[PDB]
Design a protein around this ligand. Structure first.
Ligand SMILES: [Zn+2]
Ligand SMILES: [Zn+2]
Ligand SMILES: [Zn+2]
Ligand SMILES: [Zn+2]
Lengths: 170, 170
């Protein structure tokens, strides 16, 4: 029941991964003004706060030294932020696909970390986060459907992607 | 008294230059929490709005399609935003020097554009903006002085820099 360095590394990654979702969705909201990005950004702020509560619980240094949109300590996220906002700027459909894409990445990463921890505190937050992301994914894809488009998964398997989109809400 | 294409190009540049100041100062405020960046960011929002009123007056397409921090249509500003936030992240003194630096650039550019226009509407906004920037410059440099530092001008001349800092407020 003490936390391991590995479990700390997971929380540090997820704290900024939820920020990546929040910041890309804010940025795309300011561009396209589709309410889904505003709504889900707020949910990502909730998710960020959930990770932060665990960071504080274990007195782990918060990787978010600057809450400004686009700012990250781990450059994998700074890179993804730049990549994804450039793709999302092209059209409403490209922005919705970027939404699905971030949810796809986040679900895959949440599974990765869930599987490395036996910690009831941590597992619980991750499960809740994953339930959230599956709902975000369903929301983005349904919106892509309204535009006569769809989504091809990149990080999660085809099979898990189909199980997410063929079900209702959690 | 009609506006020229050249005068339009000036307003389009300044609209995003004031955004550059605003966004860098927001970003540095979120990092360092020095009240000067919050205070002056608000002034830059006022300046942004002043340019926007002229853009609307002449129905010039606003270059700001996305108000999110860090987002620019003219890449000279996207580049300066990245350069300057990286420099400002290093220390409080480096952030204050970045403040002075943006004010320096903005004053030089405002002089450039002021000198290309006979338009009373435009000249007036630019003069007001310049009075603002000179006040921001004095505020940043005084803060650098509190940290035992100072500022070397990059864009304006030494002589105009000395005339700004040796005077009181406008
Ligand atoms: Zn999330
Ligand atoms: Zn999400
Ligand atoms: Zn200004
Ligand atoms: Zn200024």
């Amino acid at each position: 029941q003490p936390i391991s360095e590995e479990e700390k590394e997971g929380l540090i990654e997820m704290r900024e991964e939820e920020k990546l979702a929040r910041d890309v969705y804010l940025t795309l909201y300011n561009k396209w003004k589709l309410q889904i990005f505003k709504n889900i950004a707020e949910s990502e702020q909730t998710h960020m706060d959930a990770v932060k509560y665990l960071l504080e619980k274990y007195n782990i240094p918060d990787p978010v030294k600057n809450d400004s949109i686009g700012v990250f300590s781990n450059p994998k996220f700074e890179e993804l932020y730049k990549k994804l906002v450039e793709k999302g700027d092209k059209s409403e459909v490209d922005a919705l696909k970027v939404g699905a894409t971030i949810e796809d990445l986040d679900i895959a990463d949440l599974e990765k970390w869930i599987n490395k921890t036996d910690n009831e505190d941590i597992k619980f937050v991750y499960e809740n986060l994953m339930k959230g992301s599956r709902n975000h994914m369903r929301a983005f894809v349904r919106m892509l459907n309204n535009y006569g488009s769809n989504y091809t998964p990149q990080y999660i398997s085809k099979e898990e992607y189909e199980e997410i989109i063929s079900s209702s809400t959690e």
